[PDB]
A paper describes a structure:
We determined the structures of the glycosylated luminal segment of mouse sortilin, s-sortilin, from crystals grown at neutral pH (pH 7.5, one crystal form, 2.1 Å maximum resolution) and acidic pH (pH ranging from 5.0 to 6.2, three crystal forms, maximum resolution ranging from 2.3 to 4.0 Å). The structures reveal two distinct conformations, a monomer at neutral pH and a dimer at acidic pH. The sortilin monomer adopts a nearly identical structure to that of human sortilin previously determined from crystals grown at pH 7.2–7.920, 21, 27 with a root mean square deviation (r.m.s.d.) of 0.67 Å for 586 Cα atom positions, of a total of 590 Cα atoms modeled (see Methods section for details). Our mouse s-sortilin structure, crystallized at pH 7.5, also adopts a monomer structure of nearly identical conformation compared to the human s-sortilin structures. Unmodelled poorly resolved electron density is present in this mouse structure at the well-resolved neurotensin binding site. This additional electron density may correspond to a low occupancy small molecule co-purified from the expression medium, but this has not been modeled. The 10CC-b domain in our mouse monomer structure is partially disordered but adopts a conformation similar to those in the human monomer s-sortilin structures. At neutral pH, salt bridges between E542/D86 and R622 as well as E520-R611 and D476-K614 stabilize the interface between 10CC-a and the propeller. In the monomer conformation, the s-sortilin C-terminus is exposed and pointing away from the β-propeller; whereas in the dimer conformation, it is interacting, through conserved hydrophobic interactions, with the rim of the β-propeller at blades 4 and 5.
Numbering used by the authors: 53 to 98, 107 to 416, 424 to 643, 682 to 695
Amino acid sequence: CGRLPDFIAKLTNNTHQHVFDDLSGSVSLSWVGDSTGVILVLTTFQGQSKLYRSEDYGKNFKDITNLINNTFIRTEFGMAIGPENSGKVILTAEVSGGSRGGRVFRSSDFAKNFVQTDLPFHPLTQMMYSPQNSDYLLALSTENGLWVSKNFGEKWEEIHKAVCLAKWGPNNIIFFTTHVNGSCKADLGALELWRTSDLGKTFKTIGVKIYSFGLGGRFLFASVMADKDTTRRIHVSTDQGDTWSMAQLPSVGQEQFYSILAANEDMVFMHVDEPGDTGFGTIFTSDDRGIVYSKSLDRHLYTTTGGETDFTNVTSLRGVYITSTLSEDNSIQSMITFDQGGRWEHLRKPENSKCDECSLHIHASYSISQKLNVPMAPLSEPNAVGIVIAHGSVGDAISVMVPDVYISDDGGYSWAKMLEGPHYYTILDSGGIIVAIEHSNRPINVIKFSTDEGQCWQSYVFTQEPIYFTGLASEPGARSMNISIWGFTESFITRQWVSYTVDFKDILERNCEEDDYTTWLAHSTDPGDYKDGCILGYKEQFLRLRKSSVCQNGRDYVVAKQPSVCPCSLEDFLCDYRKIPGDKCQGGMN
Ligand SMILES: *[C@@H]1O[C@H](CO)[C@@H](O[C@@H]2O[C@H](CO)[C@@H](O)[C@H](O)[C@H]2NC(C)=O)[C@H](O)[C@H]1NC(C)=O
Ligand SMILES: *[C@@H]1O[C@H](CO)[C@@H](O[C@@H]2O[C@H](CO)[C@@H](O)[C@H](O)[C@H]2NC(C)=O)[C@H](O)[C@H]1NC(C)=O
Ligand SMILES: *[C@@H]1O[C@H](CO)[C@@H](O)[C@H](O)[C@H]1NC(C)=O
Ligand SMILES: [Ca+2]
Ligand SMILES: [Ca+2]
C-alpha cells in the first residue's frame, strides 16, 4: 500500500480545538439544518445547564446560556429540532413547584434568538412537529391532555383529555389513543383510537379494544384485543383508519409483542415475538397493502418488549438488511438478505481471516447492550454506495473476543478486515473519506483516515494533549468534510470536555471529475446468468468513485445510477399470486 504524501501539513492548520471547561457530567449534541454548520451543545450537571452554539461545523462554539436566562433544561425532553432547514429548536425548562404550567425556550432562526414561553400545561412528552407544517406542534400534558399549537408553540389549546399516545399522520392528521374509565396502563387493551383531521375541531373514532397503534410507511397499524380472550391481533389501514383489514399475522398473548422493524412506501418488516421469555421471534414481510405477510426469518433475536434487536438496514445498497438470529444452541449468528427478506444467508468470511469453514458475524445493539468491547453498531450511508462498516467476529457465532472492524464495498457480498482493534468510524463526503478512532480505555490522540474506501490508512496526531475519547460528530447525510473528535481531560475532581474538529478540505483539494468515476453493476454475482444483478425485478448500474481517485465528491453530490428492468420470474411473486412490493419486473413469466 502506497500512502499519499504530506498529509500532516494539510491537517495541522485544519485542526480546531474547543474546550468546554464547565463542571457538567453529561453532554448532548444536536445539528440544526443542512448546509448550515449549526450545532447546539447542551451540558448538564445534576442542577445547572449550559448552552453552546457553533455555526462552523463545530470548529468554534459560543456560550449562549444567557439566551435561556440560565434556566435549567430538562434533558428528558431533549432538543426538539424542527425538520429540514426550518431552523426550529425547542428546549424544555424546569419550573418551581407552584407554577401553573411549564416553560419552553423556542427558536425559529437556528438558535440565534430564543423566546421564553410559559405554557398552560406541564409537558409530559417532547413537542412533536407535524411533517406537513413545522409550525404545528402537539404534546401530552402531565394530566394526559392532548395539546396542539398552530404557531410554533406560542399558543396552545387542549383538544382532548385522557390521551395515552398521540402521533402526527400525513396532512396534519393526528392519531391518538384515549381511555374512558381508568388510566392508560390499566385500560391497556380497552383504549379507543381517535383521529382528527382539523386539529381537534372534529373527531372520528377509528378503533376500539385498542392495545396500541403505530405508523410505518403508508400503513397505520393497531393491535386489537379479542372479544372473549386476552390475545390480540394486528389490523392495518391505508386510508387513515376509515377502513381496516385484519393482518394475515398470528395473534399473540399478553406476554408477547409486535414490533415494526422497518417500513417504507412499499412494505413493512414485522417482528412477531414468540411465546415465552426466550428472546426471539419471527420476521414477516408484508405486501404493498400491509395485509399479506410471508415468513421471512425464523428465530430472530429480539430480547424483550422494549429490548434489543440487531436488525440493520444496509442503506448503502437497495434491498440489503443484516440482523442476528438465535441458533438452536442459543448462540448468535448474523444473517444477511439482499432481496428485501426473500432469502437470508450467512455473511461471507473474508478470504484472509481465519476461524476462531465459517462465516462473518456482526456486532450491533445487542452486543453493545451486553457490554462487549464494541463502540459502534454497523454504519452505512445511501450516498456512499456499497460501503458497510462493522465490528465483527469470524467464526461460528458472535464472540466476546476483541473484535476487528470489517468493511464491505459491495453491500455485504464480500468482506475484508478494515482495522485490527475496535474503532469508532464515520463516513465523510459520500465515501470520499473514512475516518476511525481507536477504542481504548487509555487516552488517545490519533485519528485514522482513508481515501480509498478503507484499503489504505494514514494516522494523524491531532493533539499533543491526549483525551479520553467519547464519540464522533459529523453533519448528518455524510456530505461534509468536517469531523468532530469528542473527549475529555480528567483531573482529581472534574472532567474537562473538549472537541477537535478536523477539516479535510486540503486532503481532498480537487473536486472529482467525470473521469474519477467508473460504472459498477450492483448485486453482481455471476455475469454468465441472464438475470445477474436483478433484485426485485430490475438491476442498477452506478457510477462509483475510483478508490485511487483522491478528490471531493461535493456537498451537492448525487449518486448517478441507471436501472434496467429484468424479466419476471417466479422469484418476483408472493402468495396472495401477487408481485412482491417494490418489484418492477416486466415480461418474462407469470
Ligand atoms: C432502508 O434504507 C434505504 C435507504 O435509506 C431506504 O430507501 C429509501 O426509501 C425512502 C422512503 O421510502 C425514500 O426516502 C428514499 O428515496 C429511498 N432511498 C434510497 C437510496 O433508496 C429503505 O426504504 C429502507 N428500508 C425500509 C424497509 O425502510
Ligand atoms: C465544513 O465546515 C466549514 C466551515 O468551518 C464549511 O465551510 C463554509 O462554506 C460554505 C459554502 O462554501 C459557506 O456556507 C460557509 O460560509 C462556510 N463556513 C464558514 C463559517 O466558513 C465547509 O463547507 C464544511 N465542509 C463540508 C464539505 O461540508
Ligand atoms: C431571568 O432570571 C432571573 C433570575 O433567575 C429572574 O429574576 C428573571 O425574572 C428571569 N426572567 C424571566 C423569567 O423572563
Ligand atoms: Ca417472547
Ligand atoms: Ca477516493
